[PDB]
């Protein structure tokens, strides 16, 4: 049922409704979680970084979905204005974040939670908002795959 939540871009949107379930993970699957903010903040200010990496996020997702079909990974996106519980649980203080949860150890499955499970974090800064190569390499190393991201020469 979880796998079928993927939109046409192959990305699953976290909601306040499905979050309690999704945060419990899927056995064997990595969780790639983009934590963002697509609207304005309370101050009425946009998040240019969120918007920029969003496109980088999807490009790399598409590449991996196409070149690593066997790969046990799930791509998620959560907006901090839409899922306040995830914001509290994850003690979020800013955006955007990109974190990757490895699958829980089988013997420790029932104790898996986005909130308490260790994760890799890809450092998001304006300097790499659009570097699909570097982000691609990041995931390829974690997922143990070899990919080629379109970037010309």
């Amino acid at each position: 049922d979880i796998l079928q939540l993927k939109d046409d871009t192959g990305v699953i949107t976290v909601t306040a409704d499905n979050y309690p379930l999704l945060s419990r993970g899927v056995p064997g699957y990595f969780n790639i979680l983009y934590i963002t903010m697509r609207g304005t903040n309370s101050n009425g200010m946009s998040c240019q970084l969120c918007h920029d990496f969003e496109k980088t996020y999807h490009a790399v997702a598409d590449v991996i979905r196409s070149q690593a079909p066997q790969s046990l990974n799930l791509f998620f996106t959560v907006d901090v204005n839409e899922v306040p519980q995830l914001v509290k649980d994850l003690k979020l203080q800013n955006v955007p974040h990109l974190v990757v949860y490895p699958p829980a150890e089988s013997n420790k499955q029932s104790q898996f939670e986005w909130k308490t499970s260790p994760f890799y974090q890809y450092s998001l800064v304006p300097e790499n908002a659009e570097n699909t190569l570097q982000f691609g390499d990041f995931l390829a190393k974690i997922l143990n795959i070899s990919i080629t991201v379109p970037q010309a020469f």
Side-chain angles (χ1 to χ4, degrees):
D1 285 325
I2 294 194
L3 290 97
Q4 204 56 57
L5 300 184
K6 302 180 183 180
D7 56 43
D8 49 39
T9 72
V11 181
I12 302 166
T13 301
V14 181
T15 65
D17 178 51
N18 71 22
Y19 162 69
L21 167 67
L22 298 184
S23 62
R24 261 66 161 193
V26 178
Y29 283 80
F30 290 88
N31 303 160
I32 298 94
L33 181 59
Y34 189 42
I35 302 179
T36 184
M37 184 178 70
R38 292 181 173 90
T40 59
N41 48 45
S42 186
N43 305 169
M45 294 305 282
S46 203
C47 171
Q48 192 56 35
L49 186 39
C50 306
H51 177 275
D52 291 331
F53 187 70
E54 173 94 50
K55 329 269 278 302
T56 299
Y57 188 50
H58 271 103
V60 174
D62 298 353
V63 169
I64 290 165
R65 180 189 55 187
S66 170
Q67 303 178 19
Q70 290 297 331
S71 184
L72 297 173
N73 67 76
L74 298 166
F75 287 79
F76 301 85
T77 289
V78 66
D79 187 297
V80 302
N81 290 136
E82 300 176 351
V83 194
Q85 197 59 57
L86 177 149
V87 173
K88 184 198 175 185
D89 291 344
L90 273 48
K91 307 158 55 68
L92 295 175
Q93 291 179 306
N94 53 66
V95 299
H97 294 266
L98 188 295
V99 299
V100 178
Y101 296 99
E105 314 284 12
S106 293
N107 46 300
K108 291 185 208 298
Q109 185 74 240
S110 81
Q111 66 185 77
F112 177 85
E113 269 176 332
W114 286 354
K115 144 169 37 88
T116 57
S117 298
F119 55 91
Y120 305 97
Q121 180 161 195
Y122 186 73
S123 52
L124 250 26
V125 292
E127 217 203 327
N128 68 12
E130 283 175 26
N131 189 347
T132 58
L133 184 53
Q134 171 167 283
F135 182 63
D137 268 330
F138 174 71
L139 299 177
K141 293 181 180 173
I142 292 162
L143 299 171
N144 195 17
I145 51 181
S146 293
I147 52 182
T148 299
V149 178
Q151 83 103 352
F153 221 50

